[PDB]
Every structure is written in C-alpha cells, then in structure tokens.
C-alpha cells in the first residue's frame, strides 16, 4: 500500500494495491501420432529442375 | 539400382551382332540418355558412344545404337577379331544418389 500511494503515511480507509492470479503448474503438449517422414530430399535434390 | 544386362553373346565374323541394356522408369525413363564404354583386356578403357546418337573420333563407323523407351540397344556391322573386349552401358537416375550407375557388363565371342 505504501508503494502504491507513493508515501510513508497511509490514511484511514481501504485501498486497492495489486491483483492476485494463480500461476500454472505444468505444461501439456499434444500433437497427432504420425511417424512418416516428409520427402524434402525428393524435391531438394533432383538432377534437373 | 544397377542396370540389367545379359551376361554374354556370341557371333561370327562377317555379320551384324546386337546387344541390349534394359532398365526401369526411374533410371532410363523421363528422357535420360545412355552411353557406352569398352574394356580391352588389361588396357585402359575407351568410349564408344555418348548421347546415344553422336559419335567421337577414332572409332570405326561399324558401330550404331538407339533406344526404345525402356530399353536400349547397339549393333555392330561386321565384327572383327579385335572386338574381344567388355562392353558397359551407363545411364543416370532421378535423384542425386544415382548420378552414375553402370550395368553388369557383356562380352562377345567371335567365330
Ligand atoms: C540433397 O542431397 C544432399 C546430399 O548430397 C542431402 O544432404 C544430406 O542430407 C542428409 C539428411 O539430412 C544428411 O544426413 C547428410 O549428411 C547430408 N549430406 C550433405 C552433403 O550435406 C540433402 O539433405 C538433400 N536435400 C535436402 C533435403 O536438402
């Protein structure tokens, strides 16, 4: 409260100083279950374009 | 992805002999030329035909060849006694893996 009011003396009353927020606990990553490799070398090689 | 080639052929002096080199759609397909090479017994080898239609210098005119889609062939008109050597057909491939692929090899016998 002292920081919010920028003073060393706080008058009688009710003040708003900050916001409470719950922090996340863990990360969940989900992707499709595929294994085939993309044929980038099929096009990036090639004798003649 | 080696090219197929019959093991050997025989012939008689004075008449035409023919050899063939067969492959697949990946190697000879998509318009890829086939070249030919020699192998003299115990001697540095030499070229026969490049581009399948042209011909270099120093080679007798009795050699010819042409390709039919999937296969290719060459003909010798009037084989002689010095034709005892090994012949190779070489082509390319679609990918950079097969820039230079050779056949197994074929040999001729006179008489
Ligand atoms: C094109 O061909 C080259 C090889 O000439 C490929 O490079 C190789 O790629 C593989 C897979 O990533 C590596 O394991 C090799 O070490 C690479 N070799 C070289 C020469 O770097 C290249 O990946 C092909 N095309 C692409 C997809 O870039």
From Swiss-Prot, chain A:
Glycan attachment sites: 25, 27, 33, 45
- Function text: Attaches the virion to the cell membrane by interacting with host receptor, initiating the infection. The major receptor is host ACE2. When S2/S2' has been cleaved, binding to the receptor triggers direct fusion at the cell membrane. When S2/S2' has not been cleaved, binding to the receptor results in internalization of the virus by endocytosis using host TFRC and GRM2 and leading to fusion of the virion membrane with the host endosomal membrane. Alternatively, may use NRP1/NRP2 and integrin as entry receptors.
Impact noted for substituting residue 41 to D: In strain: Omicron/BA.1, Omicron/BA.2, Omicron/BA.2.12.1, Omicron/BA.4, Omicron/BA.5, Omicron/BQ.1.1
Q: Which domain of life is it from?
A: Viruses
Annotated gene: S
Counting on the full-length protein, the chain here runs from 299 to 347 of 1273
Quaternary structure (record): Binds to host ACE2. RBD also interacts with the N-linked glycan on 'Asn-90' of ACE2. Cleavage of S generates a polybasic C-terminal sequence on S1 that binds to host Neuropilin-1 (NRP1) and Neuropilin-2 (NRP2) receptors. Interacts with host integrin alpha-5/beta-1 (ITGA5:ITGB1) and with ACE2 in complex with integrin alpha-5/beta-1 (ITGA5:ITGB1). May interact via cytoplasmic c-terminus with M protein. May interact (via N-terminus) with host bilirubin and biliverdin, thereby preventing antibody binding to the SARS-CoV-2 spike NTD via an allosteric mechanism.
The outcome of changing residue 48 to T is: In strain: Omicron/BQ.1.1, Omicron/XBB.1.5, Omicron/EG.5.1
Start and end residues of each stretch annotated as Disordered: 21-37
* Protein name, UniProt field: Spike protein S1
